[PDB]
Design a protein around this ligand. Structure first.
Ligand SMILES: CO[C@@H]1[C@@H](O)[C@@H](O)O[C@H](CO)[C@H]1O
Ligand SMILES: CO[C@@H]1[C@@H](O)[C@@H](O)O[C@H](CO)[C@H]1O
Ligand SMILES: CO[C@@H]1[C@@H](O)[C@@H](O)O[C@H](CO)[C@H]1O
Ligand SMILES: CO[C@@H]1[C@@H](O)[C@H](O)O[C@H](CO)[C@H]1O
Ligand SMILES: CO[C@@H]1[C@@H](O)[C@H](O)O[C@H](CO)[C@H]1O
Ligand SMILES: CO[C@@H]1[C@@H](O)[C@H](O)O[C@H](CO)[C@H]1O
Ligand SMILES: CO[C@@H]1[C@@H](O)[C@H](O)O[C@H](CO)[C@H]1O
Ligand SMILES: CO[C@@H]1[C@@H](O)[C@H](O)O[C@H](CO)[C@H]1O
Ligand SMILES: CO[C@@H]1[C@@H](O)[C@H](O)O[C@H](CO)[C@H]1O
Ligand SMILES: CO[C@@H]1[C@@H](O)[C@H](O)O[C@H](CO)[C@H]1O
Ligand SMILES: CO[C@@H]1[C@@H](O)[C@H](O)O[C@H](CO)[C@H]1O
Ligand SMILES: CO[C@@H]1[C@@H](O)[C@H](O)O[C@H](CO)[C@H]1O
Ligand SMILES: CO[C@@H]1[C@@H](O)[C@H](O)O[C@H](CO)[C@H]1O
Ligand SMILES: CO[C@@H]1[C@@H](O)[C@H](O)O[C@H](CO)[C@H]1O
Ligand SMILES: CO[C@@H]1[C@@H](O)[C@H](O)O[C@H](CO)[C@H]1O
Ligand code: NA
Ligand code: NA
Lengths: 343, 343
């Protein structure tokens, strides 16, 4: 499993990027832009306390309230939420269970968050809100399977959640909701390949799921639905390169996909669709630096990509999509650890 | 009192990234036209009838499962609707939601996936009716939100999930009312935002999570007013953006968050005005886009991140221009009528 992303990132409801990581005290810390623009100053790192043993995973409820999910020291899923959009936070609360991966989080079309995690039996399990952006939560339910990566979730363009994970054969496997908002899922299906990172999944501008993962030769590979919210899936295709972290995928403001990963010189690299969201991929290009995590990418309120990665000083560093060339790297300070539950 | 010439179509971005437009043909049926490809300058399906007989502007909205749904007043003065049975698939029959309505419908979705529809009653109060479950029937009863209004209503969601409706009052000021909490059937009382408006209000959410309203004023200039705090008060003073506009204004965000407004001028050309530099920047001068139009423009961002504008032409066809120097005007053919229920 290629070096993990070390923060969870969200666009707040007021257009500010907020990042969540694990400090050297195993607490969750967060940092937010002071202004909704590229190159904004930051609040500085502020602790949400807790003691976690996974990557913390933020998700925005449909009412704009942020909510963070993490594995606790008792192996349960814990969460903490804003009591009002972009306002104060709750205490940490346990959702129980015994989990063995990072959480994977998405929201159903009815506003109910669904959380996925590997169990003690290596199966995929999930637990959900029973009302829009609200408790009470459901019981934990097994979706079976036997998985060997962190799971990744995204919604189809018809409202059906879908989960991706590496299997016992190191192939990519997936499972999907049969209908929006449903607790009834499909059987597991193999998409084959041999993957050497967690998978990441995104929705294309034209309503198809597309998955990226590192392959056996450390190249970047991808595979996609060929019909909106449906099959068949494509064959795997190589995007070449040699990468030494998990890949991070994001959509530009114009729909063009762009992928970030660490290279074999420990620098940040990227590759992008050219011309349009239907266009052919660029060559790989360096964004320099010396990074000690996978990168994390998000679009800011100015429509520009922003990238975060740990530096050799263990601070979080930032670089963004200025024109004609990307910005200088700038430090957000902090000291972050990789608490990913599967590495 | 005067209501500026209405938009001729309702527009939506489909779940597969294609612009779809809905208007009223010379037979009083609703017709739609869709891009064949999710790109600027795409060819179109051509106009296809959804039948019905309507006496309002038709209003499309996308359900949280991707299914389009159109709302319009019928020749019986009731609210009618028609929906896709699956995302971008076939349509239902038209079905009545009853009532007697005296405005165009205003439509939005709650944070729990329930569509909420607002219309003026024969008592000139604002009424509403909603889905009782996410993207699903049954529908609620018609319920009054009181007030006395003299324009078509406009609705948008706050950045904290609370719906908010805007309408002109008996005193020609802009008035508004808001949900007390997300998903609620409990609304505030009506509050005055003052001014003197000679159009329906047009409302948008800013890149930084504030509502902003545009309207024509008594001197036919474009005016706007905004929340000064995300999802809260106080509202700003009214500010003039000058011009002489002979239609309703159309407001949209660029891919970078910059607001941009389109309106017809005294020579019946299309004009526009935009924020410069960023979504926090000052406004440009008005500039012409030429053409000769017989409706207000309608503006939407396409899947390539470019603004697309539609307006009825001298030949009653729908004409298109897009943010390429802008493209040449091109005809999408058709023959449309202005069925707006308040003119
Ligand atoms: C979520 O963080 C902590 C959790 O891992 C566990 O140690 O229980 C604590 C409360 O007792 C939580 O604060
Ligand atoms: C999701 O957490 C647990 C799972 O890993 C397994 O140990 O079975 C338990 C139920 O018996 C679950 O609560
Ligand atoms: C869009 O505006 C005009 C249209 O209404 C029609 O008169 O045809 C002209 C081109 O011939 C266009 O400029
Ligand atoms: C206020 O709503 C929060 C909700 O966001 C959380 O998932 O679950 C909490 C308790 O389970 C709720 O109280
Ligand atoms: C995805 O979960 C497992 C997979 O890991 C195994 O290789 O193959 C199994 C099917 O026999 C799947 O259920
Ligand atoms: C994603 O799986 C790929 C496979 O598609 C390729 O043929 O062979 C690759 C070897 O690098 C595998 O890792
Ligand atoms: C129902 O649509 C599902 C789709 O969600 C999945 O990605 O791929 C499946 C085919 O492997 C499809 O049958
Ligand atoms: C076409 O735009 C690409 C952009 O997507 C990439 O981030 O950065 C490249 C170099 O600035 C640009 O050429
Ligand atoms: C998030 O990084 C924090 C930093 O903000 C704090 O000052 O010091 C902590 C201990 O070094 C760090 O883990
Ligand atoms: C929306 O069009 C409807 C039509 O579907 C219905 O049959 O008849 C109505 C008149 O009663 C029409 O207004
Ligand atoms: C399939 O869901 C549709 C819904 O979109 C419509 O609002 O209302 C219809 C009638 O209740 C529903 O059946
Ligand atoms: C919004 O509805 C009405 C308004 O039309 C009237 O001018 O003033 C009333 C209060 O005096 C409002 O409640
Ligand atoms: C509760 O927040 C509401 C806001 O939604 C409305 O726009 O403006 C009101 C003040 O006029 C606020 O009190
Ligand atoms: C700064 O971008 C603006 C654009 O928003 C407007 O559509 O058209 C203007 C003229 O092309 C541009 O200068
Ligand atoms: C939407 O415009 C339609 C057009 O497509 C049809 O051919 O002819 C109808 C009658 O002119 C028009 O109203
Ligand atoms: Na609130
Ligand atoms: Na004027």
């Amino acid at each position: 499993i290629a070096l993990s992303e070390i923060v969870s990132v969200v666009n707040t409801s007021d257009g500010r990027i907020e990042v969540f990581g694990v400090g050297t005290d195993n607490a969750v810390w967060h940092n937010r832009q002071t202004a909704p623009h590229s190159g904004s100053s930051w609040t500085g790192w502020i602790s949400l306390n807790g003691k976690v043993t996974s990557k913390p995973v933020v998700y925005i409820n449909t009412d704009g309230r942020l909510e963070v999910f993490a594995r606790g020291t008792d192996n349960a899923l814990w969460h903490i939420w804003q009591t009002a959009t972009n306002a104060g936070w709750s205490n940490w609360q346990s959702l129980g269970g015994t989990i063995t991966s990072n959480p994977a989080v998405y929201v159903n079309t009815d506003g109910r968050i669904d959380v996925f995690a590997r169990g003690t039996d290596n199966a995929l399990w999930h637990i959900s809100q029973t009302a829009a952006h609200s408790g009470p939560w459901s019981s934990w339910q097994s979706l079976n399977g036997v998985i060997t990566s962190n799971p990744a979730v995204h919604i189809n363009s018809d409202g059906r959640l879908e989960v991706f994970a590496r299997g016992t054969d190191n192939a990519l496997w997936h499972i999907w909701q049969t209908a929006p908002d449903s607790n009834q899922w499909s059987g597991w299906d193999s998409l084959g390949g041999v993957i050497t990172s967690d998978p990441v999944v995104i929705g294309t501008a034209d309503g198809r799921l597309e998955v990226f993962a590192r392959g056996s030769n450390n190249a970047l590979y991808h595979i996609w639905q060929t019909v909106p919210h449906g099959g068949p899936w494509s064959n795997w295709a190589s995007l070449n390169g040699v990468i030494t972290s998990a890949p991070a995928v994001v959509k530009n403001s114009d729909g063009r996909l762009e992928v970030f990963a660490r290279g074999t010189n420990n620098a940040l690299y990227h590759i992008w669709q050219t011309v349009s969201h239907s266009g052919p991929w660029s060559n790989w290009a360096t964004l320099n630096g010396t990074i000690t995590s996978a990168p994390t990418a998000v679009e800011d309120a100015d429509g520009r990509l922003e990238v975060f990665a740990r530096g050799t000083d263990n601070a979080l560093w930032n670089i963004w999509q200025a024109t004609p060339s990307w910005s200088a790297w700038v430090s957000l300070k902090g000291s972050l650890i990789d608490a990913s539950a599967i590495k």
